[model samples]
Structure formats: structure tokens, C-alpha cells
Target chain A: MLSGNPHTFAIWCDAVESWSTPAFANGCLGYFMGGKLVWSSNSTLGVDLSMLSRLHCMRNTVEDAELFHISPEDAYRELCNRAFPSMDSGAESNDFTHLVSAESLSDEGYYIFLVEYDESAKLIYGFKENSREAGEVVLVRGEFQSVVRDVLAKS
Target chain B: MLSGNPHTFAIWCDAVESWSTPAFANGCLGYFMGGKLVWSSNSTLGVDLSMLSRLHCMRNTVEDAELFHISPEDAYRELCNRAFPSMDSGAESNDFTHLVSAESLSDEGYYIFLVEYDESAKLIYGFKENSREAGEVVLVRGEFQSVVRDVLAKS
Candidate 1:
């Protein structure tokens, strides 16, 4: 069962430079845990939503980046498989619980996810795969659910 | 005339996630001076080619990112105008000299430029404009020209 107000979450989508041209060439993703941000240097990816929003602001101007909602449980399970492919245990680990998930529709693809666990927030991002990359970061402090909601609202 | 071996340089392009799909979405730019890497938080932009290269690696894989050379002098002048839009004197000043310029073809856009000046290295990046962002960073140390050449060669 989820413990925190906002326990598990995920976000994925195809990132692009501008909406006018929107080619959707690259993909990105992020994950979070227990109101705080959690990720590993190995497979886990992270990104700063504030930073992404800023990029969105510059390109789209008046309009906010479009976003779609998804099931936190499903996102958590799928992300676990992709992030920790070698871990045969699957998403049934006792280490964490699901919170929320968000995604965007673009020519390419990108995503963000969150989970409920005991840890601090940090950021790790870069390009990966084929024209794809991942990122992990803490949006803000206190009331993780509210922060996530606010980010989604703005996006 | 430039003083250092590779005194000034520039690079600009429309950054994307993958070459296969290629979308001109976001724009980015970088600048360098005196082979030391000079930029101000104000208008001067910079980027860590190594980091971008890493992103390129994940997306493009075996194939290297494509690049096009430009006149360092012209790039320096144009970048100065855009970066320091408030400045009235234009690109002529004793503050710095030109080194090199490099550009790329993409659906969106991005760029990088270098100059020959005396300063240290640092990094600054974030989103700005409308789905646009700028970055500043140092590539490497020692023999700026050779390092720049190596970066361009690999890029």
C-alpha cells in the first residue's frame, strides 16, 4: 500500500524543441519516490521538471507543455522492468511503492514517474539509447503530491 | 589576428533526440574564448560538448553527430549581437578576439562559438525563450586548439 500523500509516480514522453515544428526526435523519462526523488546512477534516470518547464516556456511561449495521465501502478511496473532489466524479481520488491505517472504525446517520446520510498532528492540526466535520454530530480520540498499536481497542472 | 593556436570558436544547432526522426524543436548555443572558455551569466552562452556528445552517442550510436564549419569571425559577431542585445558598440572591441565557429543542420536549431580570452571554465544551462534554452561550459583543459579540434573531429 502507498504510505505518503503522493506515493508512486511516472512520466514519459517524446521531447521536442518546438511545438510549431514538433518533430519528436528524442525521448526522456523521470522517476520519484516517497515525496522525495529517488534514482540510481546505473539504470535509473532523472530530470528537473522546472528545467523542462523552462525549455517548454521558451519554445511554446504562452502555452504550457501538453501532458497525459497514466496509472501509477502500471507505470511503476513497466519502468522497473526497463530501468532494471537484469533484476528478475520484477516490480514486486518491498523496497518501494507506486505513487503517480504522467506522459506526453510527441513525435518522439518522454516520461516521468514517482514512487513512495525513504530517500533524498537528486538529479541525473543525459542522452541515452538512440536519440533518447532520461532524467531524475526533486521538483520541490514538502507535500510531494501537491508539487506533482502543480507540475502537471502547469505542464 | 588571433593570438592563440585556436583562439575563438562557436557552435549552434537545433538539438534533437535522434537523427532518424529529426525534429527541429528546441534551440541551443555555446561559446568559447581565448581557448579558456569564457561566458557570463548574462548573455554569454556555453555548453559541455562532452555532455552533448554523450547524448548524441545514446541516440545516434555508432554514427557520429554531423557538423558544419563556419567563419569564427562571422559567428563571433553575430553571437555577440544576439547574446548582448543591450550592447550598442557591436562586435568590435578590445575585450576579445575570434577563434573558431561550428554549426549543424537540424529541424529546430543549436550553435557553439569560441573566442580567445583570459578566463577560467564553468557551466551554466537551463531553458529560456519559447521552448529554447542556452548553456555554457568548458570542454577540456590544455592546448585549447587541439582539444577543440579533437572535439570537432569526434563530433
Candidate 2:
């Protein structure tokens, strides 16, 4: 079951694409934990802005798998409290859960879904169809930072 | 004598480098006119964050050379009027002229200075202290756009 300090775990997605046109697209998700930034996917290709909706599904699934069993709703409420202490509670109606199905997220394109538990992070990725089959791996902090630095420098 | 519809002319500098460290620095200045983006330097090297002061010198020189006389003070006032109409006149005390000498700007690093006059633009560039000698060339509006696109795409 997934578990962590929660306070130190956050995820964000970024894309290096032209705003004026739909060409030259590349993107990746970044996980920040234990004072380090790790890339969700080992490779920097196959992710783009269109895949952002899958983040909600990944967040819900990971929240459900946590050993402490905090509901995704509560986790989201905590996020809102920290981000906007004075915002009206009506803002909570903007639900982000189940925006995309996990099976569709795995099949539509390449992705790396990350979950942290027991002081460790794991990546669930690879193909859901064809002989490639889905796969999972443990995430190591600082493992992908150098590679990302090189890619961004040359970009 | 420099001349142009100043309303349609603008210049800005940009660098593609890491913000967290003093490394991987590459920069260039851009001029916007005739609805197109033209690069000041033909090559994308040698300019960095430290060289921003040179922009004021370039602007002052260009303004002084214009056929219609407008003091740098008046030009700056016009800029302030458009950008911050509500700003107090006390802000005029912040002068940007003479921040760097043209000779120093030329010698300290490779740079391309652009001046538009009589409905035409020109570039003054190359080395000042070496046998290569500073060179002048008429500016072509779209000449550098494709090259900059390629560089930024690869970046």
C-alpha cells in the first residue's frame, strides 16, 4: 500500500512545445519528494499537453492505494486549503477525479504513473496492449535529474 | 539619420540558459518590426544576462541618430506613459542611458547593434580591436527568422 509524508510529495507536468503552433511537442511529469526532482518516465518522449487529464486518475488511484486510506476528496480539500485559504467552498465542485480511465490512459499513449508508499516510489508504465505488456519499476531519487538537465540544456 | 515609425519598432533580449546555475548560457537580442521577429546577432553565442546593460546604450545611440529630434528623456517619458500611465513622475529618476559604453559593449563580447533609418534597417557588428574590423550590413526583415526558429526548436 502506498504511504508517505504527503507534505513532501507533489507532482507537476511540463511540456516543451511552441505556444503558437501544435508542432515540436515533448513533455514529462516531475515528482518532487525528499528534496529531489524525479522524472515520471525514463524517456522524455510520447507525453504532451493532451495527456494532462490523466493526472487526476493517477492521483485518485494512488490516493486509494495509500495505507493511511485518505479519500481523494479529503486529499484534494487539503490541497485547496493550503493553496487558497479564503476561497469559497463552492470551488470544491470542480472535481478532478476520474477524468480519464486508467485503462484508456495506459492505452491512449505512453505514460508513467507514480505512487509513493512505505517511504518508496514506484512507476507503473509500458504498454497495456500488444506483446510489450505493462511493467512497473521502483523510482530512485536523482536518477533522472542529470538526464533531464542535459535534455533541457540542449533544448 | 535613423528614422522609423517608432510605434511599430520594439527590441528585447532573451537567453536560453539555466536559472539555477552560471552555466549553459546562450543569448540573443530580437527586433520586432513589420510584423516579424528578426534576430540582432546572426550567431547565437557570447551574449548572456550580464550584457543587458548594453541595451540602454544602443537605444540612446539610436534615438540620438533619428532625423526627428526627441531627447532620450522625452522618449523615456513616452515609454512610461504607455507602460504605466499611473506611475508617478518620480520614476523618471531611474535613468537607463549611458549604462554601458558602445566601445565597452563591442569589446567585452560579440554583439550586433541594429539601427533603423529612412524606412531601412542596418546592422553594425564584428570585431573592433582585431584585423577582422567592424562590419556594416543592411538588415533584412526575415533573414534571421528561420535560423532562430531552428536553434530554438533544437533547444
Candidate 3:
């Protein structure tokens, strides 16, 4: 008797640019399906934090006061400010999202974030990454496709 | 902690090979475990002889007269001639029992007493299987291998 209700799409990227230095006590990164990425509440999304700030330099903190207080060059030009996509891949883009950020690279709080698109364009986008203070908790995994024959519209 | 009371043996095969015919409505030849055959009442051992013979089917009538009277077949032949097990190996029986009888294997009255030993031979053989027309209930059983551990020895 149970059907579907699995959906997600989160945010919280710091100094953008694939932010991955030592940040991620929570800054997650998941979004896969058949290839197996499921997103079970807390898996640390293949975490790398550049090998953990060179092995334990510690600094694992990310809060993202709306993109870590913004300004790292306008947070990478407002990370292209465009999270379109909602079932409109007629070609003009928005196949769910084509912009991103939060890929910070490193300096201490690398609250990285990146998954690009999915959920039939339940969209977000691509910015390469950006952040202000460092915040990551990205687990937004939404996909369990099973509409029950389109609600018993049975085939 | 359950290490105490649980071994029992109480046999009573008083011969003449108790009868057996009917299949349902209430009357004798009953007694099985793991093989499903339980009837403390609600009648189902039938042979009807007017309510399983003048009303005394060893169980479920006679006011539950000790669950239906019919013992003394030499009290199950002196308790299965001092407990069966020999001259036949008998797969080494061992379950628990609380048999009772009161005449219903098609009437003929002599009912049929069968105690089938093994409830700890501590020996109360349930007063050798009581019989003043069925009264004192509790048909004893418990032979944890050697109960009475020698009836407390006497010298």
C-alpha cells in the first residue's frame, strides 16, 4: 500500500569552487542511482577533503550563512544565480540545472558540493563552487521512481 | 535460571489395547503433540455412543471429571509395566503428557487409561494414576532422568 515520496535537493556551499580542503563534518555530496549512491541520511558522500586537510589538520566546520556570508568575489558571481529545471529540457537548458559552485578546493573549511542534475530536472545547477565561512550538509538525494502505474492507471 | 523443574515421566498403558474407531464428534484414541491433537473440551474425539458412550469419554465431560475417567487398566499396566523403552528401543520417547480417560472409545465403559511415562520418575506416578471414579486431578509427571534422586534415600 505504500508508494513513493523520496525527494531532495539541498544547498550550503562555501567559497564555491568544489570547496574541498578539510570541511565536511556535515557538508555532504551524494546523488546517484543504479550506479549506487542511495543517500541514506549520512554517508559523507565519497568525501575527500583533499585527503582531509593533509591528514587531520582538523577544521571540519561549515554553516553557510546563506552561502557563508557571500563575497568571495560575489561568491563567484552569485554562482550564476540560476537554478531552473523543473521538467523543461526542450533544449534551452534547465534540463534540471546547468550551473554549480561550492567546490572550494581548500584553505581550511572546504564545504564542497556538487551533483549537478537529476530528479527529471528537479534542478539546481552548476557553479564549480563557492562559500563564505564554510558550510556543507548536502544530502539532497531525491529519486525513488514508482508512481504505481501512474496511480493505477494500470498498463 | 530455568535449570530446575522440567523432567517428567508418567506412563499408564493398562492393556486391553483401548479401542479406536470414530474420527470426530468426540470419543477416544487421542493424544498427540507437534502432530496437532489437543482437546481439553469442546468435543472432537467423537464416536457418539450417545455422547461418546453413556457420557464418559475420558475427557471433556463427566464434569471434566478429572478430564474424563477410565484408569485402572492395572493403572496402565503397572505404569507401562514399569515404563516401556525396552524390547523395542521406542525411539527413546520424551515429550510431556497429562493423559486422562473416562469411557468413550465407543462406550464399553472400561474407558481406557493411558499415562505413557516420562515426567521425572521421582515417583508419584500420580498416585499410580488415581481412580475412585476420577476426582483428585493433577496426574503427576517429572522424571528429570532420576528424580527423587533416590526418594531422598533412607538406609
Candidate 4:
């Protein structure tokens, strides 16, 4: 619901990007959707040095992530398709829905965070943005604000 | 951050209002910030009938609750003053640092769902938009998509 909506998308980006800055003591400085977060940067909120180096490699080719914006109608089609590659796009309304990451401008670089939501299970499905099959799908137990708090306290 | 920020303010309204309709069989029909929900209406994902009727009372008097847009610099001052009447607007950020609510528009009245977030103890401070004291504050444990699935099943 929040992913594809333009208004939510814009404002969420502003707040996330703003709060992710050194301001507010880094109360929230990570990428969040539903119950989880993706920590791809070092901030006043700390990040693992090893992980930070890996992300830096990612950054050499990929710029900082940006909010993905699409009309509700298009999201229903494209994002949902990417989220559930095999499921009929016309699958039941309750089927696992899609949430794609910011557009990756690189043709050879395609590892964006692909999130899938299972409404009844409180599940977040994470995939390498180009995974073409289910067996390759990955699952993540992610954190958003809590991790922000966790890292902020340590920092 | 979501509260005092106007960009987040606008998009949140759009997403909350958009999901709120019976569209998508009412996927996630509520407002969410930091993993919690602030529900505003009845949809396929329902609320208690009696409670819904009670809001109908609010609707009759407050026919619409439209988004309020103002400068973020001023919001931290004005919105908090309204949320905590006796509290000084001079209070610094740590005292009571969060605002969570849907905006309200009024030609004749102004009672939006004013929610205040307390950092010390993960508590939500809810007041009837213009209330002036702790006596009027209410607390809620909130979530959105999951809550909707939960409520939809119960209904």
C-alpha cells in the first residue's frame, strides 16, 4: 500500500532521508518497509565495517537508493509481477503482493531489494531484484526503527 | 519526523486515504507510522460496529478530515502545543518528540486524529486534534496491514 502510492512514496522518502541524516540523533537511519529495514549506509547510527565496505562497492556502481514511485494502477501490474513472478497476476486479491526497490540504472548491476508482502503472515519476502524463480527467493526477518535505535545507541 | 515533516504529511494522507477505500478488497486501509496503525474508517477490513457508529458521530460533526499542510518549522511548535495543552512550546525535542496523526480540514470545526509519540516508553499519545491536556490523551497499540488482515478475519 505505501510502496506504490506516490504521496506516501514521496513523503516517506523525505522523512527517511531526513531522519537518516545526522539530525535527530539518527533516530531512524535505514531503509524500511513494513517490519524490516535494509542498512546500506554508515551514519551516526553505526554499520559493520565489513558490511560498509561491501555496500561501498555497491555504491561505486549504484548511487544511493531512492524512493520508487508509480501510480497505484501500474504498481498493481509491474511491482506485483516482480514480487510474484509465477503467480497469475490475476491471482486472488489476498495473494502475496510486490514491493520493488528503487530503479537500478545499471544493466549489469541488478541486486536491488525486492520485497514481497504476505498479508496474513506478517511476512516480508526479500529477493535479489533479478531472481527469476521461487527456489531462489530469500526470506528476511528485518528491522526498521528498532535497528535504528539499536545502532544509534551503540554509536 | 513523519509528523513535523510536510512531505511525509502529504503522501501519508494519500496512501492512508487511498488504501482506506474498498479498493483492492481493502488491502491496508489505515494509517501507519513506525509499524503501528491509526485507523480512520470502515472498509472490507473492518472495525467494531459500535466503534464505527461512534466515528459516524464524528463524521456527522466533522464531515471530513482533510490533510493539514504547514511549515515543518512551525509544526513542531503549533501541533505539539495543541497535543499537550499545558506543556510549553518552548520544550525541547526530547521532551515529547513525535507527532502521528491524519490531518483535519474544517470550515466550521477542527478535530483531527491527533497522536503524540513518547520516546521514553513506546507510547502513543492520542487527543482529539485540539485537546489541551493529558486528561484527554488516549493510548493505542497499532499496526496496519496485519491489523487489517486480523480485523478482516474477525469481521
DockQ for every model, please. 0.01, 0.01, 0.00, 0.01
Error of 1 at B33 (Å): 5.1
Q: Model 2: runs farther than 4 Å from truth? A: A1-54, A57-111, A129-132, A140-155, B1-155
lDDT of 3 by residue, B20-74 (tens): 3233333223222222222222223322223222221223211223222344433
Q: By TM-score, how accurate is candidate 3?
A: 0.13
Query: What is candidate 4's lDDT per residue for B1-155, written digit by digit as tens?
Result: 02221212111222244555554333323344344344443333323222322332222221111212333234434544433332122111121123322222111122223332331112222333333331122223232222323333444
Give candidate 3 regions above 4 Å deviation: A1-6, A9-59, A66-155, B1-155
Chain B only, TM-score of each candidate: 0.26, 0.29, 0.18, 0.23
Please give, for residues B64-145, the per-residue lDDT of candidate 2 as tens digits: 2441233333333333232222112211122323222122233343234444444444443332222244433444443332
Docking class of 3: incorrect
- Backbone clash numbers for all candidates listed: 79, 3, 72, 4
Candidate 4 residue A63 C-alpha distance from true site, Å: 27
Residue A105 of model 4 has an lDDT of: 11
- Please give each candidate's TM-score: 0.19, 0.19, 0.13, 0.18
Tens digit per residue, CA lDDT, model 1, B105-132: 1111222333222332212222212113
Residue-level lDDT of model 1, residues A1-155, one tens digit each, is: 12233343333322443422332333343344334433322211123343433332123211111111223333334443343232123111121122123222111122233322233222222222212334444433233444444554644
